[PDB]
Design a protein around this motif. Structure first.
Motif, PDB file in Angstrom:
ATOM      1  N   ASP A 134       0.806  -1.212   0.000  1.00 47.00           N
ATOM      2  CA  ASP A 134       0.000   0.000   0.000  1.00 47.00           C
ATOM      3  C   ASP A 134       0.843   1.267   0.000  1.00 47.00           C
ATOM      4  O   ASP A 134       0.438   2.285  -0.571  1.00 47.00           O
ATOM      5  CB  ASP A 134      -0.939   0.023   1.200  1.00 47.00           C
ATOM      6  CG  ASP A 134      -1.856   1.221   1.157  1.00 47.00           C
ATOM      7  OD1 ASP A 134      -1.910   1.981   2.146  1.00 47.00           O
ATOM      8  OD2 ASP A 134      -2.464   1.431   0.083  1.00 47.00           O
TER       9      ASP A 134
ATOM     10  N   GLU B 190       1.675   1.903  -3.503  1.00 50.82           N
ATOM     11  CA  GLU B 190       0.521   2.357  -4.281  1.00 50.82           C
ATOM     12  C   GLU B 190       0.290   3.840  -4.027  1.00 50.82           C
ATOM     13  O   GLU B 190       0.089   4.606  -4.965  1.00 50.82           O
ATOM     14  CB  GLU B 190      -0.762   1.586  -3.930  1.00 50.82           C
ATOM     15  CG  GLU B 190      -1.973   1.963  -4.805  1.00 50.82           C
ATOM     16  CD  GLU B 190      -3.349   1.719  -4.189  1.00 50.82           C
ATOM     17  OE1 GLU B 190      -3.465   1.389  -2.987  1.00 50.82           O
ATOM     18  OE2 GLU B 190      -4.356   1.883  -4.915  1.00 50.82           O
ATOM     19  N   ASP B 191       0.350   4.222  -2.754  1.00 53.87           N
ATOM     20  CA  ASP B 191      -0.020   5.563  -2.311  1.00 53.87           C
ATOM     21  C   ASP B 191       1.026   6.638  -2.533  1.00 53.87           C
ATOM     22  O   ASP B 191       0.717   7.840  -2.448  1.00 53.87           O
ATOM     23  CB  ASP B 191      -0.315   5.524  -0.813  1.00 53.87           C
ATOM     24  CG  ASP B 191      -1.585   4.777  -0.495  1.00 53.87           C
ATOM     25  OD1 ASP B 191      -1.886   4.630   0.706  1.00 53.87           O
ATOM     26  OD2 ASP B 191      -2.287   4.324  -1.426  1.00 53.87           O
TER      27      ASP B 191
ATOM     28  N   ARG C 117      -6.480  12.513  -5.731  1.00 53.61           N
ATOM     29  CA  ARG C 117      -7.034  11.181  -5.942  1.00 53.61           C
ATOM     30  C   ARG C 117      -8.562  11.220  -5.935  1.00 53.61           C
ATOM     31  O   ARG C 117      -9.167  11.959  -5.160  1.00 53.61           O
ATOM     32  CB  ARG C 117      -6.525  10.230  -4.861  1.00 53.61           C
ATOM     33  CG  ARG C 117      -5.019  10.260  -4.669  1.00 53.61           C
ATOM     34  CD  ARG C 117      -4.305   9.307  -5.619  1.00 53.61           C
ATOM     35  NE  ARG C 117      -4.370   7.930  -5.135  1.00 53.61           N
ATOM     36  CZ  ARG C 117      -3.624   7.439  -4.148  1.00 53.61           C
ATOM     37  NH1 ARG C 117      -2.732   8.203  -3.524  1.00 53.61           N
ATOM     38  NH2 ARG C 117      -3.767   6.172  -3.785  1.00 53.61           N
TER      39      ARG C 117
HETATM   40 CA   LIG Z   1      -3.587   2.763  -0.983  1.00 53.61          CA
END
Ligand SMILES: [Ca+2]
Ligand code: NI
Length: 335
Positions: free
Chosen positions: A46, A49-50, A194
Motif C-alpha cells: 500500500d 501504491e499511495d 485522488r
Molecule cells: Ca492505498
C-alpha cells in the motif's frame, strides 16, 4: 520468545497499526505471526501504491512483481517518502520472517499480494466509473485482504473451512471497511489529487467530483454522501453473517473491531456537511468502548443496530436516497 527479526516485525506492526497491533498480538498460536507478517507486507504494498513521488513507470513493475519480492532475500526499496517507508527499507527482515511461516500461510499471502498488485496497477491511471467498478477497486485493495485473512484463519484450523471458502462474505467485510474509508476521506483524497467516489453516482449531482468542495454545492454534496453511505450499508448483512460463523474468540475480536468502527464512522458521516467543509470527529473514548465491547454477537449486533437506528431517524424525507436508506436499514433489522 522472539528472534531479533521477529521482534523488529512486531516493532513495525506497532509503528504502522498503532492501537490495533494489540488485537493482532492477541491472536491465538500460529495465527499471530501469520497475520502480523501479512499486515506488514500489505502495508509495504500500500505504501508503494499511495506514494505519489514514485512515477507510474517505476511503480507498476513494483506492484506487478511485489509477490515475487517475498522470495528475494535482499529485496528492499529505499526511495519512498511515505509514512510507513521503514517496512520497504527493511523489507528483507519482513520477507525473512515470511519465508519462515508454514507453506500453507505463504501460499495465501503470496497469492493475495499477486492479485492485489495487479489490481492496484490497473487503477493507477483511471478514476472509478460505475458502482461495479467501485466494487472492483474495493475488491483489489480491501476485499482481497478479507479473503486472504479468511484463508489464513481456515488454514490454521482455528476457524472452520467455510470461513475461507465463502469469498463473497469475506469480500464484503473488506468492502464495508473500504467504502467507509473512501466516503470519510473525500477531502483528503481530493486534495491529494485522488478520486475514488464513483462517477456513475457523483455525476448525477455535479460536473466534476471536486465541485463538492465548493460551498455553493454543499446540499448536492451531502445528498451524494448519503447515497454512497446507503450503498455501503448493503454489506451489513454479510458482515453479520461472517462474524456469526467465527468460533475463535481472538479471531472474533480481530474481525469485529474494524467493522464496529466502520459503522460508527458511517453514522458520524451521515448527512454531515463536515465531510466536505471541516473535520469529522468520532469521539475517541467511544472508539475504545466499541473495541472493548465488540466481543460477542449479541454485543456487536447491539452496536450495529443502534448506529443504524440513529441514522434511520436522521434521514431527511427530501433526501433522494431517503427511501432506499430506510429500506435497507429496515430490511437488515427485519432479518
Ligand atoms: Ca492505498
Ligand atoms: Ni426506529
Amino acid at each position: 520468545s522472539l528472534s531479533s527479526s521477529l521482534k523488529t516485525c512486531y516493532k513495525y506492526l506497532n509503528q504502522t497499526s498503532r492501537s490495533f497491533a494489540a488485537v493482532i498480538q492477541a491472536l491465538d498460536g500460529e495465527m499471530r505471526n501469520a497475520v502480523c507478517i501479512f499486515y506488514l507486507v500489505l502495508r509495504a504494498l500500500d505504501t508503494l501504491e499511495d506514494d505519489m513521488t514514485i512515477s507510474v513507470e517505476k511503480k507498476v513493475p513494483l506492484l506487478h512483481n511485489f509477490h515475487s519480492f517475498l522470495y528475494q532475500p535482499d529485496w528492499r526499496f529505499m526511495e519512498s517518502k511515505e509514512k510507513d517507508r521503514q517496512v520497504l527499507e527493511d523489507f528483507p527482515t519482513i520477507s525473512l520472517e515470511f519465508r519462515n511461516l508454514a507453506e500453507k500461510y505463504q501460499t495465501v499471502i503470496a497469492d493475495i499480494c499477486r492479485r492485489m498488485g495487479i489490481g492496484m496497477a490497473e487503477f493507477l491511471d483511471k478514476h472509478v466509473t460505475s458502482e461495479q467498478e467501485w466494487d472492483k477497486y474495493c475488491h483489489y485493495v480491501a476485499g482481497l485482504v478479507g479473503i486472504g485473512l479468511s484463508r489464513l484463519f481456515s488454514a490454521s484450523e482455528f476457524e472452520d473451512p467455510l470461513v475461507g471458502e465463502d469469498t463473497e462474505r469475506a469480500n464484503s467485510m473488506g468492502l464495508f471497511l473500504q467504502k467507509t474509508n473512501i466516503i470519510r476521506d473525500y477531502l483528503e483524497d481530493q486534495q491529494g489529487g485522488r478520486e475514488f467516489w464513483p462517477q456513475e453516482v457523483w455525476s448525477r449531482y455535479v460536473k466534476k467530483l471536486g465541485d463538492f468542495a465548493k460551498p455553493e454545492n454543499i446540499d448536492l454534496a451531502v445528498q451524494c454522501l448519503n447515497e454512497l453511505i446507503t450503498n455501503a450499508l448493503h454489506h451489513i448483512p454479510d458482515v453479520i453473517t461472517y462474524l456469526s460463523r467465527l468460533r475463535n474468540q481472538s479471531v472474533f475480536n480481530f474481525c469485529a473491531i474494524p467493522q464496529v468502527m466502520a459503522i460508527a464512522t458511517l453514522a458520524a458521516c451521515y448527512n454531515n456537511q463536515q465531510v466536505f467543509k471541516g473535520a469529522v470527529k468520532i469521539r475517541k473514548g467511544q472508539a475504545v468502548t466499541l473495541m472493548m465491547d465488540a466481543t460477542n454477537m449479541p454485543a456487536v449486533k447491539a452496536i450495529i443496530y443502534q448506529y443504524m437506528e440513529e441514522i434511520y431517524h436522521r434521514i431527511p424525507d427530501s433526501d433522494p436516497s431517503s427511501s432506499k436508506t430506510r429500506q435497507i436499514i429496515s430490511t437488515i433489522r427485519t432479518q
